Ligand binder design. Structure first.
Ligand SMILES: [Mg+2]
Length: 295
């Protein structure tokens, strides 16, 4: 059970040693905006050398996987497979693929609130999108899902159209994630998908199926590919309500890093109130502190 203990010394060598793999959130963990966390690339190197699997889990739905993978090299994390990176955009496409309720002849079109990167991910999964060029000579395909992603061009009209589609109770409502906002380099903040999801949910009177963290689906999507043991896996993140909760639901050992959104103070407060799902097992100032555990 989570005690929010600072991970160091003997315990750190025991935890890392027994760990068969590490799942990393990206923003606020590996980097902050234009700046990599010093020692983070070295940690990933040593993990590889120690035979421990590193996987990456991001709620990003703004860039498709190939472009998202570019950030790793850009910020000094070389030698990484695209297959190591899991994003809400990627997992949302796969979930729609699995769940679109249309007949095999026409599984249904997806109405997307989001950018070109997200649309690219969806098409690559073989998904038909509303707004795409119609066949012929032919009507517009029936919309069977609304997907809410990070939409920098969100609008009242798009909100209204989303509601029109959701008038059909058989139409799915899916959101890539529920992150309410994100910190920017200048200290400001940008609205998150969670804020757009709140509007669609409220206007339509429906609850969205959430793909990304802290929903366990992305982990199930990871197990789809690799065989990993949650009991032997670390989940490292900077955001309590997203990353740590995620780790708890998946049965992973959770590590909060302090280089991101959440503060030690919040973690300790949750512990006081006895909300153990939001309490990390361990914390470190930055993931650069984990490296000594590999000796
Ligand atoms: Mg983060």
């Amino acid at each position: 059970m989570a005690r929010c203990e600072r991970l160091r010394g003997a315990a750190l060598r025991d935890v890392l040693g027994r760990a068969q793999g590490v799942l990393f959130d990206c923003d606020g963990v590996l980097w902050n905006g234009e700046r990599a966390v010093p020692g983070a690339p070295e940690l990933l190197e040593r993990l590889a050398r120690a035979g421990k699997a590193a996987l990456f889990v991001s709620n990003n739905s703004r860039r498709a996987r190939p472009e998202l993978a570019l950030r790793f090299a850009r910020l000094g994390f070389g030698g990484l497979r695209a297959e190591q990176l899991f994003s809400s955009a990627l997992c949302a496409a796969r979930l729609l693929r699995q769940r679109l309720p249309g007949p095999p002849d026409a599984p249904g079109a997806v109405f997307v609130l989001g950018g070109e990167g997200l649309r690219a991910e969806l098409r690559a999964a073989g998904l038909r999108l509303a707004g795409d060029p119609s066949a012929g000579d032919g009507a517009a395909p029936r919309v069977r899902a609304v997907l809410v992603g990070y939409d920098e061009h969100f609008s009242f009209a798009k909100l209204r159209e989303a509601c029109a589609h959701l008038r059909d109770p058989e139409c799915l409502l899916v959101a890539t994630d529920r992150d309410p906002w994100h910190p920017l380099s200048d200290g400001s903040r940008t609205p998150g998908t969670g804020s757009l999801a709140a509007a669609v949910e409220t206007a339509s009177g429906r609850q969205a199926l959430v793909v990304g963290k802290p929903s366990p689906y992305m982990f199930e999507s990871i197990t789809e590919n690799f065989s990993i043991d949650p009991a032997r896996t670390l989940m490292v993140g900077d955001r309590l309500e997203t990353d740590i909760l995620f780790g708890h639901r998946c049965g992973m050992t959770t590590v909060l890093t302090l280089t991101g959104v959440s503060r030690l103070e919040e973690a300790q407060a949750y512990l006081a109130a006895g909300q153990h799902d939001l309490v990390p097992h361990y914390y470190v100032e930055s993931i650069a502190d984990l490296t000594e555990g590999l000796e």
